[PDB]
Each structure stands twice: as C-alpha cells, then as structure tokens.
Amino acid sequence: RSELTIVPDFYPTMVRNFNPYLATNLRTTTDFIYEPLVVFNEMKGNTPVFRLAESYKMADDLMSVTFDIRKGVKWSDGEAFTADDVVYSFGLLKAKPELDQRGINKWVTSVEKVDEYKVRFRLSEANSNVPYEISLIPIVAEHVWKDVKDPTTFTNENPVGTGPFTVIDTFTPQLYIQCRNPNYWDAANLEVDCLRVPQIANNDQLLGKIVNSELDWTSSFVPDIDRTYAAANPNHHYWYPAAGTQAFMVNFKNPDPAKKEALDNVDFRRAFSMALDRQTIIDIAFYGSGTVNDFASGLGYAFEAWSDEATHKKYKGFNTYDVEGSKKLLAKAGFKDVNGDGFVETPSGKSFELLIQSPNGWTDFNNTVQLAVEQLQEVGIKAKARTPEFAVYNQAMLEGTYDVAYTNYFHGADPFTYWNSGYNSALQSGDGMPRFAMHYFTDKKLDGLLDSFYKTADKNEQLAIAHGIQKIIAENQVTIPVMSGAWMYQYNTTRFTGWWSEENPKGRPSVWAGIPERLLHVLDLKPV
Ligand SMILES: CC(=O)N[C@@H]1[C@@H](O)[C@H](O[C@@H]2O[C@H](CO)[C@@H](O[C@@H]3O[C@H](CO)[C@@H](O)[C@H](O)[C@H]3NC(C)=O)[C@H](O)[C@H]2NC(C)=O)[C@@H](CO)O[C@H]1O
Ligand SMILES: [Mg+2]
C-alpha cells in the first residue's frame, strides 16, 4: 500500500481525538474524515468544487439556500449520506454552541430536510457569502452521533466518515496511520492508500526529518530553505504562494493597570508600531519570505484594490520604521523615563514590561518576537519574549491574560476573512473560538459593517463598506500589522507525483487543517 507522510500539525504526543468540532482534535479530521458539501478554491476566484453536494441554489433575496446532496454517497460504515446528516450537524451546533467554532449559528436560523437529498438553510440575514461559510462546517453522521451522550466531550476515537481516509490502521503516541475509506464515493480518483502521521513536536525536530527526506507533504517553517532542505536531495521541492497578514495583537483587557495604561493608548500602539523594522523581521526571521504590511488596518498590499488609499496614506507613517517618530510620539503621549533606566514609564509614572508571546516551536515567530524586543528597547519600551506551548499561548488569549501576542491569520479571496476573523467582537466569546479576535477591542459600528459586508452581491456596495472598516481599524491602530506571509509548503517527489506547484498552481497547496483544498490536492497525488 502507498503511505503518504504528512505533517498538518505538531504535537508532543498523539492523543486520539477525531471530534471535528473540538479545538483538541487531530488535524487530519476535517476534509480527510469529514468531507465537505463543497470546497471553495480560494486561489482560483473562490470557485466552488462540489463534493458531497452536487449543487446549491441561493434564493433571489439571499436569505436562504438549498443544497442538493449527491446520491450514492456512503459513510465509511456503509450507511447512506443524506440530508439527515446535514440537518443533524447544524442542529447539534445550535444545541451546543460551544461546538460552533465559526459562529455559524447567528447567520443560520434553521436547517431543514426538504427530501432525502435536499436541505434548506433559512438565514437570519441576507448573506451572499453563506455558501462559503456553510462549506466550512463539518458534517457528521446522524446515525452515530444521535447516540452520543455528550458531544462536547466525545473524542470520536472510532470515526465514521465520508472522506477519503477514515480507517485508523495504527495509533501510538508517536505515530498514527489513517487509511482509505473502503466505501469512499470518489474512490476511483483516490490513489493514495493511507496518510502516515508521525509525531513531531516543533520546527527543530521537523527540520531533521525533512532534510533527511522522511516526509512527503509539509507546510512548516524551514529556515534557509534553499540551503538546508532544497539542496539536500533533488526530490525536495517547495512552493510558497502569497498569503495573509501577521501582526502583534495587543490585549485591550489586560489585568495589570500599568500595562493596560500603555496598551489601551492609541499613541502608544502607534509608537510601538513605528519602532518595528518590518523588512528586517522579514529578512532575518523569515529568510526574506514575506512582504511588508504597513496598513494600519492590516489589509496588506495584495488587497490594494479594496483599499482607500487616502486612509492607507494617512496612517502608514505609524506603520513604518521610524525610531525618531516613535520616541517623539511616546514623549508627546506622556510616556517618559522618570527613573533613569532608559525605559519609559506610563504617563502616571508606573513602570511596566510587556511580555510578548509566540507559540513554542514556531521558531520563525519566536525569532520575530526576539527582534521586536530589541527594536522596542531602542525606543525605550521594555519587553520580554515568552514562548509558551501553543495550548497555553492560545488559552492566554482566550482568557485575556496575555500582554502582546504575535500571530498570523487566515486569508481568503477577499479581505473579509482577515477583517471578520480578526475583529468581529462576536468572535471574542466562546470556548471553541480561535484566538484571532481576542484583543477585546469592540466597536458596534465596526461589527455592523462586518455583518453587512455580504448583504448584497453588489461589489460597489461592498467596497464602500470595506472603506468604512479600513478607516475604523486604522484610526484605532487596533493591532500592529507586520507583514503578509506565504502558504509555506514543501513536497517530496521521491514517493509521489502530481503535486501542486508554481508550474502546476491549482490552489492553496498547504496541508494545514483549515485549508479545505488539501482534499482536492491529495486526490491529485499518484504513488511512484
Ligand atoms: C482544530 C483545527 O483544525 N485548527 C486548525 C489550525 O491548526 C490551523 O492553524 C495553522 O496551524 C499550523 C499548524 O500548527 C500552523 O503552522 C505552523 O506555523 C508556524 C508559524 O509560521 C511554523 O513555525 C510552523 O512550522 C507551522 N507548523 C506546521 C506543523 O506546519 C499555522 O501557522 C496555523 N495558521 C493559522 C492562521 O493559525 C488553522 C489554519 O490553517 O485552521 C484550523 O482549523
Ligand atoms: Mg524608566
């Protein structure tokens, strides 16, 4: 049998959890076990690729959508995939909203079975983007989950799935192997037999394995990639197409009064931003991979057509390396060194040191923070790097105990993915929410604009809304955007061919969970 060795995530040890609704799951659950109704190819104009649904139809008023389910699709246990599974899954997320990690509940009023192969979503608001938003919600088997006592703690260790790889062939603390669904509806197009998923804890362990040609499909940071990895074997390849924003997020609800006095001050956030040398961060921490992001709104240069250039220009100076301007702004805001240590105190005279966190083992981000600490010191801002394990880093954001965090964001075909995930205050509440909105800045007007972005399909209307969003975020310097990154992706031709690449650029090539196109990609791979 052919085994494809993949690394969608690092772990200290393999914990058997295939619940697609829990933040604690394994990152081969979505797509590979639970196939979507539709996969949107974001790189190719956000085009739908129909999988378990064969079609959808939005109502004229954009307030409802029906999906026609493909006939003849089976769960891995042999039972039919039907509208009942879609109705059940959305009903579960309404009953247990802690499982609604994307906040779909607010947008979907009801999900009803029309017949065995047709489901109707009634929406709470007109929403031209709802097919995409629905496409991300995992669909589980009603005939299994109806008998689950507590879906919020169920580890789903024996998953029944619709996707290509549902058989748990091997499971050990150091390795699991996920083999092909024997009843897979699209078996005729699937040539890979199993996913081999070794336990790897961090970038340093990853580097040894990747250089030694032990892996097939990864999306890791690899330092000095041309020298360490690409030159090590003629079969070692990579393709890094452009992706989304990375930024320092500041906690507006910090529990320390001196830190809150700094972090909550827009002039301080701007001075912090002007202390940073974004191009040096890119050159040193990312080995040159990335583009400076000097948009106070975080928009980035790839989305310039969505940008109000007057807004970009008005705030760009606060997002440009400018030590002189940073120091002048600190002084003008009243942040002065009143105790002779070379570090500013708050305007009320309090000392403070900002703890800047990034996830342990994400060495590109760790090195970014170290550079930022040195750059902040030059303007008199005292800071220290912290590298908690991801779960602790994430919990500190969900609990509001962090000071500053370096993070990336997901990245869609338009700016809404970044702006909504990064700023909608509705995404700040929920045990299964991700970290991206957890700065605790809130603005009802901003939320209203985000919630209105797709109320029409009119591009001119969406543009005016985008300009309003850009203005609010920029004028509040909510975060400190640093760069636009890349979809890191490395592939090995030793054991498989058919990979996406710059020469074969079929979609986002990442193996990370949250990139639904990885299902389409795996179906193109052919064993050697
Ligand atoms: C429950 C669930 O599915 N969560 C998904 C997230 O796992 C996923 O976030 C991305 O996760 C990967 C793996 O942890 C991150 O990759 C790491 O990135 C750092 C920083 O560049 C790099 O140093 C590491 O090498 C790299 N690790 C690996 C194993 O490749 C990635 O940065 C995360 N991206 C974001 C925006 O958070 C998200 C995103 O795909 O989807 C969730 O569903
Ligand atoms: Mg001082």
Strand pairing class (496-497; 383-386): unpaired
Q: Which atom of ligand 1 is nearest to the CA of 409?
A: 36
Q: Could you name the CATH architecture of 1-33+163-241+487-528?
A: 3-Layer(aba) Sandwich (3.40)
Q: Which atom of ligand 1 is nearest to the CA of 365?
A: 20
Q: Side-chain half-sphere of 102: how many Cα atoms within 13 Å?
A: 17
Q: Which atom of ligand 1 is nearest to the CA of 22?
A: 1
| CA 442 / ligand 1 centre spacing (Å) | 26
Closest CA to 281 of 220, 203, 383, 367: 367
The domain spans of the chain are 1-33+163-241+487-528, 35-150, 243-485
Q: Which atom of ligand 1 is nearest to the CA of 364?
A: 23
Q: Where are the alpha helices (DSSP H) in 174-265?
A: 203-211, 225-228, 257-263
Yes or no: say if 296 and 481 are a contact pair by the CB < 8 Å rule.
Answer: yes
Residue 79 assigned to a binding site = no
Q: CB of 394 closer than 6 A to ligand 1?
A: no
Structure determination method? X-ray
DSSP 506-528: -S----STT-THHHHHHTT-EE-
| CA 121 / ligand 2 centre spacing (Å) | 58
| CA 351 / ligand 2 centre spacing (Å) | 7
- Closest-CA residue, ligand 1 atom 7, reads 513
Ranges assigned E (strand) in 162-206: 165-172, 175-180, 194-198
d(CA 106, CA 97): 10
Q: CB of 367 closer than 6 A to ligand 1?
A: no
Amino acid at site 43: M
Consecutive H or E run containing 474:
helix 459-475
Residue 341 assigned to a binding site = yes
Resolution in A: 1.2
| CA 392 / ligand 2 centre spacing (Å) | 30
Ligand nearest to the CA of 382: 2
Three-class DSSP category at 311: helix
Three-class DSSP category at 365: helix
DSSP 279-310: HHHHHHHSTT-SEE---TT---GGGGGGS-HH
- Closest-CA residue, ligand 1 atom 14, reads 9
DSSP 16-73: ----TT-TTS-TTSBTTTB--SEEEETTTTTEEEESSEEEEEE-TTSSEEEEEEPTT-
Tokens, residue 426: 């509705």
DSSP 81-132: P-HHHHHHHHHHHHHSGGG-TT--TTTEEEEEEEETTEEEEEESS--TTHHH
Closest CA to 384 of 407, 354, 412, 359: 354
Based on DSSP, count helices (H) and strands (E) in the chain, helices before strands: 16, 21
DSSP 366-429: HHHHHHHHHHHHHTT--EEEE---HHHHHHHHHTT--SEEEEE----SSTHHHHHHHH-GGGGS
What's the topology of domain 35-150? Dipeptide-binding Protein; domain 1 (3.90.76)
Q: CB of 297 closer than 6 A to ligand 1?
A: no
- Closest-CA residue, ligand 1 atom 29, reads 9
Residue 337 assigned to a binding site = yes
Residue 127 assigned to a binding site = no
Q: Side-chain half-sphere of 236: how many Cα atoms within 13 Å?
A: 18
d(CA 331, CA 325): 10
Q: CB of 25 closer than 6 A to ligand 1?
A: yes
* Cβ neighbour number for residue 103 with a 10 Å cutoff: 20
Q: Sign of the CA dihedral 142, 148, 154, 159?
A: negative
| CA 243 / ligand 1 centre spacing (Å) | 13
d(CA 297, CA 476): 9
Report, in angstroms and rounded to the nearest whole number, the Rg of the chain calculated over CA atoms.
24
**Residue with structure tokens 């290509």?**
164
Residue 35 assigned to a binding site = no
Q: In CATH, what number does 243-485 get?
A: 3.10.105.10
d(CA 7, CA 23): 17
Q: CB of 89 closer than 6 A to ligand 1?
A: no
Hey, which of 7, 9, 406 would you mutate to test ligand 1's pocket, going by the most ligand atoms within 8 Å of its Cβ? 9
Left (φ > 0), alpha (ψ -120 to 50) or beta: where does 456 sit? beta
Q: Which atom of ligand 1 is nearest to the CA of 485?
A: 21
Q: CB of 9 closer than 6 A to ligand 1?
A: yes
Ligand nearest to the CA of 337: 2
Tokens, residue 102: 């994307």
In terms of Cβ atoms closer than 10 Å to its own Cβ (0-12, 13-18, 19+), residue 38 is buried
Three-class DSSP category at 451: helix
d(CA 71, CA 47): 22
| 53-58 β-sheet, strand order | 53-58, 64-69, 118-123, 108-115
Q: Which atom of ligand 1 is nearest to the CA of 514?
A: 41
Q: CB of 203 closer than 6 A to ligand 1?
A: yes
Tokens, residue 497: 């061919």
